[PDB]
C-alpha cells in the first residue's frame, strides 16, 4: 500500500523580486501487510 499524508500539489511561494518561485512537495510512505507475504532474492556472483 502507498500511505500518502500530503498529496502532491503545486505551491506558489513569495516573489521578493522580479521572478516567480514554485514548489512541488509530497509526503508518501510504504506499507506491507506481512513481511513473509513477499520474497526478495538477492543476486550473488560466483563462489
Amino acid at each position: 500500500t502507498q500511505m500518502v499524508l500530503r498529496a502532491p500539489k503545486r505551491t506558489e511561494l513569495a516573489k521578493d523580486g522580479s521572478y516567480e518561485k514554485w514548489m512541488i512537495e509530497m509526503e508518501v510512505g510504504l506499507r506491507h501487510r506481512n513481511p513473509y507475504a513477499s520474497g526478495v532474492l538477492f543476486t550473488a556472483a560466483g563462489k
Binding site: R10, Y19, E20, K21, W22, M23, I24
Partner: protein, 48 residues
Amino acid sequence: PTLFVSYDQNGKKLSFANWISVLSPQDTPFVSMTGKESINQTIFSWQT
C-alpha cells in the same frame, strides 16, 4: 517551475525585422524627360 529563468534559454526565436533600411535616393529628374537618340557607331559628331 523552480526559480524561473529566462536568460539561459537555448532555442530563441529571434525577433528579426522583415525589412531592410535603404536611403540611397534615385531622383535623376533631368534624364527622365530629356529624350535619347540612337546611333550606330562609337563616335558621333555635330557641325559648328
